[PDB]
Amino acid sequence: KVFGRCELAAAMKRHGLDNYRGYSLGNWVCAAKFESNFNTQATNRNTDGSTDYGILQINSRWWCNDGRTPGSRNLCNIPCSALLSSDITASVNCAKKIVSDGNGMNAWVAWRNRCKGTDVQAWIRGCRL
Ligand SMILES: [Cl-]
Ligand SMILES: [Cl-]
Ligand SMILES: [Cl-]
Ligand SMILES: [Cl-]
Ligand SMILES: [Cl-]
Ligand SMILES: [Cl-]
Ligand SMILES: [Cl-]
Ligand SMILES: [Cl-]
Ligand code: NA
Ligand code: NA
Ligand code: NA
Ligand SMILES: [Ru+3]
Ligand SMILES: [Ru+3]
């Protein structure tokens, strides 16, 4: 599913991501924009052989099981395919664990490079929330 901008903001808020660990909703929408262009089915292979899955491009090295990432963990206790669903619950619940791991949203390199320090509220501007 390809979410609209405000549609995704609303879904993220319903699932408790707004201000989670102090990160306002626009941070999460901005991250999803640059990770996946709001497409739940996005996948991308990393040089190390791991793969990133879903709207927030969550990586099989640590967070989900795909059966094809040697030596990896599955800290969210989910198949990576669950991160591709039109229902964002699994992605949100796993993102909550990731953002709590110590480095906040810097875990998403694209958030650090493209969202951090910017006017992230623009990503939710105009949305009925
Ligand atoms: Cl957009
Ligand atoms: Cl915001
Ligand atoms: Cl596993
Ligand atoms: Cl594996
Ligand atoms: Cl594990
Ligand atoms: Cl599994
Ligand atoms: Cl949803
Ligand atoms: Cl933080
Ligand atoms: Na939804
Ligand atoms: Na894994
Ligand atoms: Na749901
Ligand atoms: Ru930890
Ligand atoms: Ru860690």
CATH code of the domain containing 49: 1.10.530.10
CA dist 102 and 51 (Å) reads 22
Nearest to 74 by CA among 84, 61, 64: 64
Domain residue limits at 119: 1-129
101 labeled binding residue: yes
Q: Exactly one of 7, 18, 48, 52 is catalytic; which is it?
A: 52
CA dist 56 and 85 (Å) reads 12
CA-to-CA dists, residue 129 to 24, 32, 46, 51, angstroms? 13, 18, 35, 32
Give distance in angstroms: CA of 51 to centre of ligand 10.
9
Annotated catalytic residue 7: no
Annotated catalytic residue 87: no
CA dist 53 and 7 (Å) reads 20
Resolution of this deposited model, Å: 1.0
Give the number of domains in the chain.
Answer: 1
Residue 18 DSSP code = T
- For this PDB entry, the determination method is X-ray
Q: Is the dihedral of CA 112, 51, 66, 41 positive or negative?
A: positive
What the block records as the tokens of 19 is: 């201000």
